[PDB]
Amino acid sequence: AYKLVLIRHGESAWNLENRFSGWYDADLSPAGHEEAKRGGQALRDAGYEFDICFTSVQKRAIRTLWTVLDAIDQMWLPVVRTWRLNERHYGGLTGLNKAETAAKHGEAQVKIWRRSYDVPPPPMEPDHPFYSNISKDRRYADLTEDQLPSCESLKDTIARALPFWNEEIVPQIKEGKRVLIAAHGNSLRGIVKHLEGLSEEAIMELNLPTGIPIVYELDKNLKPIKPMQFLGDEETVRKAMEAVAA
Amino acid sequence: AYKLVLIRHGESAWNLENRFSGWYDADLSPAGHEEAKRGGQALRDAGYEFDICFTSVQKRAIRTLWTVLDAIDQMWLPVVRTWRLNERHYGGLTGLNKAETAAKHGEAQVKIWRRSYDVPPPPMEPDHPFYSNISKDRRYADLTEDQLPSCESLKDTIARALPFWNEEIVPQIKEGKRVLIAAHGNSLRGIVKHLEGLSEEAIMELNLPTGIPIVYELDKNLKPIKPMQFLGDEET
Ligand SMILES: *S(=O)(=O)c1cccc(S(=O)(=O)Nc2cc(C3=CCCC3)ccc2C(=O)NC)c1
Ligand SMILES: *S(=O)(=O)c1cccc(S(=O)(=O)Nc2cc(C3=CCCC3)ccc2C(=O)NC)c1
Ligand SMILES: [Cl-]
């Protein structure tokens, strides 16, 4: 038996404008921060303990991790940030809202990019208003040209998240470390797809509740003894799960 | 040439009760958090950029670091925590206020402990109120039996802090990484003592301000080229 916990950050400041964030480093809204607090307090009430934490280089996830560590009195734990756990990169869509996206790129392309697993959105080009903000941010200075995405399908996202899982998180798990992972929807989807053997279709249909700790019981070979479970008040979990399915 | 920044955490909740905290994991008071916020604003206005951060395993220092990183938009930086940057362990005095310490231990011993570089306070014994709280905290589980103090003189604290400085932080500085250190007055004292070659008397005379970025400029031998400098408005 190993136990793994995941948490997906809540609402961001750009969610309130309905604009695509991707790699843009938007901060939690008051609501997103409350969600982090509630998840941390659920972990505390259940007495959960961790030995090492993994998050992205993006502050909505990092601040979610911080709030959780505060709530469970485990601020002293080692924390590891990696770009490989970042949100899916939304390319030229970054910063655009849905109406702007439709005007510029068409209903047809938007439908294709929405429903597809491996069709990326358009690249974020040097004239993009957020190009310098993201692609030239020094936190990616040590990425190789081939590693720095200009845009990402879900498949790209998963393909760059899973190596960090394999080479950095898995050995900690096998080292019996209790791992907490505070990241984003699409990188977490990579982890879930790998753990549970889900298809492209299922994983694209699987939305992870925000601010709800996701608990995995893994056997000796890191196979989920059961599918993901949700920690919290059973009524607020079903409500978030009905929200998410809707 | 090399630029090194230190910051001492601010007022804690046990400062408000005039209680010796030591290895007790007291949080910042609201005023102490505000101090860290102003220090961070000072760094942001100066345009300071870092590449790696070190702090202790105690939350008043960690939250000072978090506040600074938030203020300078560098929450993505790598952060390393180590017990070797902890505050002095105040053994039996942990949790006592000044009146309780006086009544229990006497003016004479209190004077000695306050004044001495190498005389530790009484050990924290198994019947001490905070014995389990600290000595059985799992964050120290990897420390050998001879590493987990029951009490520390200033000398002890500095002796256990400088190995982390020499084995981990000095390599980072020589790699060209811009280092931020968020810790505690006494553990920072060991870094300052070593950097400047201060005497026991002089380092006991040095009281580092709280919540203030302390800037060192170091030559290729990591020797300071001038006295430490402070960041912030001219008042502070
Ligand atoms: S992504 O999961 O981080 C994301 C950000 C904002 C909105 C959405 S959505 O709910 O899936 N709706 C949506 C997505 C997309 C694209 C996904 C891949 C690239 C573009 C296009 C249009 C829409 C939409 O529903 N507009 C009304 C996901
Ligand atoms: S330590 O630096 O974290 C610390 C905690 C509380 C008070 C002080 S003090 O300002 O130096 N005054 C003080 C210290 C001590 C001792 C230090 C070594 C062991 C005991 C004893 C008494 C006093 C004091 O001022 N009494 C009125 C430092
Ligand atoms: Cl951290």
User: For residue A68, what is the enclosing H or E element?
Assistant: helix A59-71
User: C-alpha distances in angstroms, A242 versus A42, A186, A213, A231?
Assistant: 19, 20, 16, 15
Identify the sign of the CA torsion B102, B105, B108, B110: negative
Exactly one of A33, A35, A87, A184 is catalytic; name it: A87
- The Cα–Cα gap between A96 and A14 comes to 10
- What are the φ and ψ backbone dihedral angles of A4, each rounded to 5 degrees? -125, 140
Residue ranges around ligand 2 (CB below 6 Å): B 20, 87-88, 90, 93, 98, 110, 113-114, 121, 185-186
Number of domains in chain A: 1
- Whether A24 lines ligand 1, by a CB cut-off of 6 Å, is no
Return the half-sphere exposure (C-beta side, CA atoms, 13 A cut-off) of residue A119: 9
User: Residue B41 C-alpha to ligand 2 middle, in angstroms?
Assistant: 30
Dihedral (CA of B204, B218, B50, B231) sign: positive
Tokens matching residue B187: 């553990």
Q: Is B224 left (phi over 0), alpha (psi -120 to 50) or beta?
A: beta
Is A59 an interface residue toward B (CB < 8 Å)?
Answer: yes
Give the C-alpha distances (Å, rounded to integers) separating A3 from A51, A84, A91, A219, B141: 11, 22, 35, 9, 20
Residue A99: which residues within 8 A CB-CB, separation 6 or more?
Answer: none
Q: Which atom of ligand 2 is nearest to the CA of B87?
A: 3
Which residues of chain A form beta strands (DSSP E)? 2-8, 52-55, 79-81, 179-183, 214-218, 229-230
Between the alpha carbon of residue A80 and those of residues A3, A62, A168, A169, B48, the distances in Å are 19, 10, 10, 10, 22
CB of A47 within 8 Å of a chain B CB? The answer is: no
**Cβ neighbours of B80 in A, within 8 Å:** 78
| Cα distance between residue A236 and residue B1, in whole Å | 56
Give the environment of ion ligand 3: residues with CB less than 5 A: A 79; B 79
Resolution in angstroms for this experimental structure?
2.2
Q: Which residue has its alpha carbon closest to ligand 2 atom 5?
A: B20
Supply φ then ψ for residue B47, to 5 degrees: 75, 30
DSSP B140: G
* DSSP reduced 3-state for B18: coil
Q: Which domain holds residue A183?
A: 1-246
- Smallest CA–CA distance, residue B154 to chain A, in Å, is 23
Distance CA(A9)–CA(B155), nearest Å, equals 45
A23 to chain B, any CB pair closer than 8 A? The answer is: no
